[PDB]
Design a protein around this motif. Structure first.
Motif, PDB file in Angstrom:
ATOM      1  N   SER C 273     -69.660 -14.674 -32.193  1.00 54.49           N
ATOM      2  CA  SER C 273     -70.922 -14.791 -31.475  1.00 54.49           C
ATOM      3  C   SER C 273     -70.728 -14.333 -30.037  1.00 54.49           C
ATOM      4  N   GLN C 274     -71.793 -14.477 -29.253  1.00 53.44           N
ATOM      5  CA  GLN C 274     -71.713 -14.234 -27.818  1.00 53.44           C
ATOM      6  C   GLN C 274     -72.928 -14.821 -27.115  1.00 53.44           C
ATOM      7  N   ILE C 275     -72.688 -15.434 -25.961  1.00 52.13           N
ATOM      8  CA  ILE C 275     -73.749 -16.011 -25.147  1.00 52.13           C
ATOM      9  C   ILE C 275     -74.415 -14.919 -24.312  1.00 52.13           C
ATOM     10  N   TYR C 276     -75.553 -14.430 -24.800  1.00 54.59           N
ATOM     11  CA  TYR C 276     -76.432 -13.565 -24.017  1.00 54.59           C
ATOM     12  C   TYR C 276     -77.663 -14.384 -23.657  1.00 54.59           C
ATOM     13  N   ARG C 279     -79.184 -17.077 -25.975  1.00 53.93           N
ATOM     14  CA  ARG C 279     -78.817 -16.765 -27.349  1.00 53.93           C
ATOM     15  C   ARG C 279     -77.313 -16.857 -27.546  1.00 53.93           C
ATOM     16  N   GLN C 280     -76.909 -17.531 -28.618  1.00 50.42           N
ATOM     17  CA  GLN C 280     -75.597 -17.315 -29.219  1.00 50.42           C
ATOM     18  C   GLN C 280     -75.733 -16.233 -30.288  1.00 50.42           C
ATOM     19  N   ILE C 282     -75.273 -13.857 -32.993  1.00 49.47           N
ATOM     20  CA  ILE C 282     -74.352 -14.227 -34.060  1.00 49.47           C
ATOM     21  C   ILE C 282     -73.965 -12.976 -34.843  1.00 49.47           C
TER      22      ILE C 282
END
Lengths: 98, 23, 488, 215
Positions: C273-276, C279-280, C282
């Motif tokens: 995932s990534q924190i943008y 949003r995580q 996915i």
DNA sequence: AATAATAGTTTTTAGTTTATTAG
DNA sequence: TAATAAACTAAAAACTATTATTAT
């Protein structure tokens, strides 16, 4: 909150560091009585999954496990933990050939 | 052929270091 | 093709080398011992795969397996280890020499046929391809006298046989270096000892040849070239694993753990995932890997770009030496002999899209014809081929403020021209090794035998310019026409 | 630090579509601004965005200038962008019912940005033209905007449906002349180097060159 | 029971932590 | 000092070892 019935003992080695400390934390949170696997007063001697009764003798430096306890996988216990219930010990006992 | 390293023929006999020169 | 290099060193025992050379200096025995420390260190720091054996002749005892008289071996054909260096280094100087002589032999005659015998039989036992093979010698005899002319003649026959076989003979003066006092008649049977001594350190070589790259200049024509990595850092010897006292490595059960089960993350249970923002977002490692697919591994040539239009301000990864070849497509080097013959339109660079690995985006590269600068001594300088400079993208830039603020007076340019003209350097490329890496080597040899540290030095990166200033003249300070000193 | 950037985009019905081969100023402007905004929000620049629309039915701006602010409708207050609002824009931003003026939305933007200088200290600001010059517009309010920019010095980027230079209509010609005078007065040679297009911004980042990454 | 695909340790490489210069 | 040399874990391919699998 059901490990109180288990006078358990989670091993530090083999049982992963994070896995181990989480297991003692869950035991003490559930009211589980932590007691060593060197003498009586143990309802369940829980040890590593892949190691057998002879390895129990060797790691514990004993000819036999202290009485009154039962040997079972921590995978079953984790399943009970997640589900927040308790399941039977059958189908998950660590293998005891002696 | 000459000019090849004695330890590894086919690679060159490299002269050792000489530092920086001042002209 | 890799091959190997088998090196064997022979020493007589007749007191002609146990002697101190009639001097307080190192004995021929002792100088050979220092030469062999140098050789062993050089072999270890370089590819240590070569085997080295220890054999001595002209000796009272026999331990060669064949048990011929006056031949005493010590070491089998082995890679030179620490224990080998210690066991050969424990026998040096007067005390080491005498203890070695009483455990090996104080000196006896030589049987050349027997030693050539055993060397042929031993070298038969090699179980691998042998790229090179050489025997170095260090003996004081000018010509064979003690042996009868029969032994000399049969040794000459065997010497011709082995020279035709491929093995060669090397020797250095011992009675007096220079002039000619050694090999008057070894001239038929056929300083520099300092080079055999410790002169070159931190050596390494490669005999490989990088893969065939396929020029995708267009869909119709794809040609074969041989890429070559010609520049890269030499690295740190690996911290291979071990134990406090049992001295034994560790395996790993390194796997991420999950609070749910006593087990680990399953490959599904682990999920990318990534924190943008809020949003995580996915994804999986599979999706990130699949994202980076652009086109095939190779060079998807955009086209030539006149090198007469070129810039030096931009800089990227060190260049790659591509070379003409004909591996799997014919006519390759036929047209490769072209484009190196003209510097008015065939020097033109090639703006090219280049994907080096499967599932890699295209990377901008440019071509430079590197004409075989075949050095006059034949040493093909700047070998014949191609220098490939990888070209920038629009993220190779962090903005800079303008610094065109001053164009100073001619008096300053004159004085600093005088300053800098008194120093020019011939630009010896090999003039500075790695002081950090060599210091790590020195730590290793300190832990090797007994040293707290064997060598305490820099590779000459330290500034000698504290003596250059007077060599250039302290005028650099009086050529400070500057009213206020910058460093205050 | 505070990149106070707004969106004064042109919307309509005959300009929300266009001839084949020439992308609509409305759709092309939307897609290019969304591309730059997605890059910025993946970089998470310290910017707040205010959205105001001209060319749609009615005027819903905080002030309509006594109907001088033609069809000026505001949507977003000056706040950090998120994905829900950008997808809402990319979905429901639709062909408008008419065409209107842009300097009205611009002056509303300067007013709100100067008023909303609190919270985040206002710093270097970049703004972009969004006009195809094929509408009906006036060429008289250049004095107010020139006084505002000569007292604020806001960097500007020009956009168009064309990156030949002879395809501009007569109204496009007069709009080009007036904006050319404005930006030669504002930036000079940079203003000429800031002349670009919606379709040009589809492939060009140098339109937003006003922001730099310093070492 | 004749060749013809591949195989398989070794060697860089590079997007991940890792400590030490970092709003 | 809340990024950055420098390392640092994973990581294809390279240069060989082979190896079978259709070749009587």
């Amino acid at each position: 909150e059901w490990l109180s019935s288990l006078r358990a003992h989670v091993v530090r080695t083999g049982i992963g560091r994070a896995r181990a400390e989480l297991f003692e934390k869950q035991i003490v949170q559930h009211g589980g009585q932590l007691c060593p696997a060197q003498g009586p007063g143990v309802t369940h001697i829980v040890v590593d999954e892949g190691m057998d009764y002879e390895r129990a003798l060797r790691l514990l430096r004993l000819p036999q496990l202290p009485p009154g306890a039962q040997l079972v996988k921590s995978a079953w216990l984790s399943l009970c933990l997640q589900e927040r219930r308790l399941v039977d010990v059958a189908g998950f006992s660590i293998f005891i050939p002696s | 052929c000459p000019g090849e390293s004695l330890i590894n023929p086919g690679f060159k006999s490299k002269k050792p270091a000489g530092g920086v020169d001042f002209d | 093709y890799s091959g190997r290099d088998s090196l064997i060193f022979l020493v007589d025992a007749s007191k002609a080398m146990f002697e101190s050379q009639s001097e307080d200096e190192l004995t021929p025995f002792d100088m050979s011992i220092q030469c062999i420390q140098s050789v062993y260190i050089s072999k270890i720091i370089s590819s240590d795969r070569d085997l080295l054996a220890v054999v001595f002749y002209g000796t009272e005892k026999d331990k060669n397996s064949v048990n011929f008289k006056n031949i005493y071996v010590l070491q089998e054909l082995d890679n030179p280890g620490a224990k080998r260096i210690l066991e050969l280094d424990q026998f040096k100087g007067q005390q080491g020499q005498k203890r070695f002589q009483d455990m090996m032999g104080h000196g006896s005659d030589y049987s050349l046929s027997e030693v050539l015998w055993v060397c042929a039989n031993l070298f038969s036992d090699v179980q691998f391809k042998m790229s090179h093979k050489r025997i170095m010698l260090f003996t004081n005899e000018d010509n064979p006298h003690g042996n009868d002319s029969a032994k000399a003649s049969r040794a000459r026959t065997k010497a011709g046989d082995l020279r035709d076989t491929g093995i060669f003979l090397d020797l250095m003066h011992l009675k007096k270096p220079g002039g000619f006092d050694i090999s008057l008649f070894y001239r038929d049977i056929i300083s520099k000892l300092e080079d055999l001594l410790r002169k070159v350190r931190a050596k390494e070589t490669r005999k490989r040849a990088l893969s065939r790259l396929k020029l995708k200049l267009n869909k119709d024509i794809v040609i074969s070239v041989g890429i070559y990595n010609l520049v890269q850092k030499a690295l740190k010897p690996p911290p291979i694993k071990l134990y406090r006292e049992t001295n034994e490595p560790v395996k790993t059960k390194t796997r991420t753990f999950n609070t749910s089960t006593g087990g680990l993350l399953l490959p599904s249970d682990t999920k990318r995932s990534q924190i943008y923002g809020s949003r995580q977002i996915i994804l999986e490692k599979e999706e990130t890997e699949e994202l980076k697919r652009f086109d095939d591994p190779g060079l998807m040539l955009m086209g030539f770009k006149p090198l007469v239009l070129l810039k030096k301000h931009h800089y990227l990864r060190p260049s790659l030496f591509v070379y003409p070849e004909e591996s799997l497509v014919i006519g390759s080097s036929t047209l490769f002999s072209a484009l190196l013959i003209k510097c008015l339109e065939k020097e033109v660079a090639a703006l090219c899209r280049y994907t080096p690995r499967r599932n890699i985006p295209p990377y901008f590269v440019a071509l430079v014809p590197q004409e075989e600068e075949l050095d006059d001594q034949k040493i093909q300088v700047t070998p014949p081929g191609f220098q490939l400079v990888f070209l920038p993208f629009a993220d190779d830039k962090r903005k800079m403020p303008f610094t065109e603020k001053i164009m100073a007076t001619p008096e300053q340019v004159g004085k600093m021209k005088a300053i800098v003209e008194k120093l020019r350097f011939t630009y010896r490329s090999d003039s500075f090794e790695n002081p950090v890496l060599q210091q790590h080597f020195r730590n290793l040899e300190a832990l090797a035998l007994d040293l707290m540290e064997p060598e305490q030095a820099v590779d000459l990166t330290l500034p000698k310019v504290e003596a250059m200033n007077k060599r250039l003249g302290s005028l650099v300070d009086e050529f400070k026409e500057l009213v206020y000193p910058p460093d205050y | 630090n505070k990149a106070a950037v707004v969106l004064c985009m042109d919307v309509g019905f005959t300009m929300s579509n266009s001839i084949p081969g020439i992308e609509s100023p409305f759709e092309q402007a939307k897609k290019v601004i969304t591309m730059f905004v997605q890059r910025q929000v993946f970089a998470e620049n310290k910017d707040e965005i205010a959205l105001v629309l001209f060319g749609t039915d009615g005027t819903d701006n905080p002030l309509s200038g006594g109907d001088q602010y033609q069809n000026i409708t505001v949507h977003r207050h000056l706040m950090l962008p998120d994905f829900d609002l950008l997808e809402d824009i990319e979905s429901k931003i639709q062909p408008g019912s008419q065409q209107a003026d842009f300097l009205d939305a611009l002056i509303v933007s300067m007013d709100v940005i100067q008023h909303e200088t609190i919270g985040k200290k206002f710093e270097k600001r970049h703004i972009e033209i969004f006009t195809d010059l094929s509408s009906r517009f006036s060429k008289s309010q250049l004095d107010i905007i020139i006084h505002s920019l000569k007292k604020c010095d806001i960097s500007l980027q020009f956009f168009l449906p064309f990156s030949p230079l002879k395809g501009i209509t007569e109204q496009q010609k007069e709009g080009l002349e007036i904006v050319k005078m404005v930006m030669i007065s504002l930036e000079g040679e940079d203003g000429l180097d800031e002349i670009y297009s919606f379709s040009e911004s589809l492939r060009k980042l140098c339109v937003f060159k006003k922001i730099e990454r310093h070492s």
